[PDB]
Amino acid sequence: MDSKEVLVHVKNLEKNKSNDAAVLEILHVLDKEFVPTEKLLRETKVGVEVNKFKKSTNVEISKLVKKMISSWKDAIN
């Protein structure tokens, strides 16, 4: 995972950050098993939208993006 691509995504996340720390620390650690790979990168596109966790995509999305991790690699496999 490219922290550069992820932290940038956090920038977007920041704008949406209804929750500062959870997503902040969640996304940071997320970098380990994060969605930015060759194929997964596009998934990072959607992973970002989850990173956005807008209105209907409530902070709960944070854990959702985690679930997204499970399927994230599932797509790469």
Helices 21-30/3-16 angle, 10° precision: 160
Query: How far is the C-alpha of 2 from the C-alpha of 19, rounded, in Å?
Result: 23
Domains in the chain: how many in total? 1
Please report where in the chains the tokens 């496999």 appear, as a residue: 77
Query: How far is the C-alpha of 25 from the C-alpha of 31, rounded, in Å?
Result: 10
Hey, CA dihedral for 15, 16, 21, 24, is it positive or negative? Answer: negative
What CATH number did the domain enclosing 58 receive?
A: 1.20.930.10
Residue from 70, 62, 8 nearest 35 by CA: 70
Range of the domain at 75: 1-77
> What secondary structure does DSSP assign to the chain, as a single string?
--HHHHHHHHHHHHHH-SSSHHHHHHHHHHTTT-S-STTHHHHHHHHHHHHH--SSS-TTHHHHHHHHHHHHHHHH-
Query: How far is the C-alpha of 61 from the C-alpha of 9, rounded, in Å?
Result: 15
Residues 6+ apart with CB under 8 A from 5: 36, 41, 44
